[PDB]
Design a protein around this ligand. Sequence first.
Ligand SMILES: *[C@@H]1O[C@H](CO)[C@@H](O)[C@H](O)[C@H]1NC(C)=O
Lengths: 50, 50
Amino acid sequence: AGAAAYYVGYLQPRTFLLKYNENGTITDAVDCALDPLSETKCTLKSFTVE
Amino acid sequence: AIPTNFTISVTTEILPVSMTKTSVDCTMYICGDSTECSNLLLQYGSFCTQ
Ligand SMILES: *[C@@H]1O[C@H](CO)[C@@H](O)[C@H](O)[C@H]1NC(C)=O
């Protein structure tokens, strides 16, 4: 056999908060419903919380 | 007319200082526990952020 590896994950219905930069490429995302911090980011619609 | 005596009157006055703090969850108030409704509520998320 060769020397290649692959990984398999399963999509699930989730809410996400994506960030489109100036040039129009998604540079970052937040997984709403991952943890309380991401939950607050989801609720407040921001990637930073004071 | 000049007073010749006095009384020491104690008056009680009540002032409300605060009221019950309250918080509201849009998702479970409007779209109680159904995912189909909550998906439709994403486009109105800004309103809840208000
Ligand atoms: C965005 O594109 C411009 C050229 O069109 C380039 O100068 C700039 O470095 C790019 N910035 C990012 C964050 O990609």
